[PDB]
Structure formats: C-alpha cells, structure tokens
C-alpha cells in the first residue's frame, strides 16, 4: 500500500551548452505537478549563490 | 479477448498512419482533414482546438467520423495533401483558417 512507481531520469538531453532538458518517468497520476512545482519553487529562490 | 500483447501491436500500426477526420455536414474541403492518432483512454475523439474553426465544430454534442486510408498511396495522400498542417489557409481567399478562436 506504500509501494508507488519509483521514477528515474531516463535521459538528460542537454541541448547545446548552459542548457539541459531532464525528463523523469514514471510518476503517479498527479506527482509530476508536485515535483515540478517543488523543484521549480526551490531552484527559483532557495538555491543560494553570489552576484 | 484483448490480451496484454495486442496494445503494443496497436501502438506499432497507429504510428505514422494518418486518419481522415470528417465533420458530418462537410461544406468545403477543410471539413476532411488527416491527423495522426494518439491513443485515448476514453470513448471520445480528442480534436485539436484551432482545427475546430475549420470544421465549424463546437463541442456541444458534435460527432465526427474517422476513415482509414488503407493503401499506401492513400496514406501518402493523407500526409502530403490532406494533413492538418497543410491546411492553414482557407482556399476561398488568403485568410488563415488556423486562427486562434
């Protein structure tokens, strides 16, 4: 009952340079949005750095 | 019986084989257009919205017919003449028919 479809990055089609395109499958009928939204909001701000 | 192995067979034959979608009152030639199928869990033809302005198709209970080009010359005519990417201008004038509705 706690067994889901554990996913994986099937490919990293890094298009050209300083640009990647990472596809992850398979997730549940609803987990693509929650992982996309979680990673999108964290990368946007939380991720530190210098400028 | 529809066993577990015929759905991979089906995703093999559907690939690169266009079909002719057709609204029932076809008035001009943009009312028969050829698509490539994408399989649907369901019982309803999913039709790309821009193409609806060509068919005069709203979604208030409309029905469409699908036809299969059997022979090889007919698959090539569906891809090279009747494909929906090829009909982006109305033949009555110069105005685009894939206008966003």
């Amino acid at each position: 009952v706690t067994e889901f479809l554990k996913p994986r990055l099937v490919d990293i089609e890094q298009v050209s340079s300083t640009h990647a395109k990472v596809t992850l499958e398979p997730l549940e009928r609803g987990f693509g949005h929650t992982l996309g939204n979680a990673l999108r909001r964290i990368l946007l701000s939380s991720m530190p750095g210098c400028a | 019986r529809e066993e577990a192995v015929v759905w991979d067979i089906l995703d093999e034959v559907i690939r690169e084989h266009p079909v002719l979608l057709n609204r029932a009152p076809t008035l001009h030639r943009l009312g028969i257009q050829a698509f490539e199928p994408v399989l649907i869990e369901g019982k309803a033809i999913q039709l790309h919205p821009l193409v609806c302005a060509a068919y005069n198709a709203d979604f208030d209970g409309d029905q469409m017919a699908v036809h299969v080009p059997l022979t090889l010359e007919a698959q090539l005519e569906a891809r090279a003449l009747m494909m929906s990417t090829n009909n982006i201008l109305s033949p009555a004038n110069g105005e685009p028919i894939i206008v966003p509705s």
Partner: protein, 95 residues
C-alpha cells in the same frame, strides 16, 4: 533535491480443540447425524476412533452416508480409526 530532502528529515493425547466439538458441527446430512446419535457418538473424538467396518454395522447407515462422513472428516484433516490415548478427557465425563 538535497535542500528539499534536508527539509524533511525531522518527519520521516486426544487430538486438539477440534476433537471436543459435537458431531452436529460437521454439517452432516440429517440421516448421518441421527444414525451417529443412535450409537451414542456425540463428539468428533468418538467418531474418529470408530473404524469404517464398525460404522457400517450401525442400523440405517448406508454406503452413501459413510462416504459423506469420510469426505467431511477429510476436509478437516481427520481420518476414521485414529487411536486417541486418554479419550474422553475428565472434563467431558460429567455431562
């Protein structure tokens, strides 16, 4: 993913109790149950000690009722002619 995972590490010898049952619990035909009661066989432990040749001497017990008794005993893992040492237990001798 490392940041989001670090933000979640604070969350994550008379057989057994079957021998003590009455013969009526065996779901036998009304004929087979009444034939066994006429011979003073009250418990499953009494029935299991009797041989097939002894049960066939019982008045009105037919070959069909004997097959029914075997099939039902076999469904419970019991067979006719098992010897139980110390049957009946002293807990049953007073009814």
């Amino acid at each position: 993913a490392t940041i989001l995972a670090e933000q979640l590490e604070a969350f994550v010898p008379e057989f057994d109790p079957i021998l003590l049952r009455p013969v009526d619990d065996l779901e036998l035909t009304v004929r087979s149950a009444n034939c066994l009661k006429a011979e003073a066989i009250h418990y499953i432990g009494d029935l299991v000690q009797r041989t097939e040749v002894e049960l066939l001497k019982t008045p009105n017990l037919g070959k069909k009722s004997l097959t029914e008794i075997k099939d039902v005993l076999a469904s419970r893992g019991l067979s006719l002619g098992m010897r139980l040492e110390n049957w009946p237990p002293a807990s049953i001798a007073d009814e």
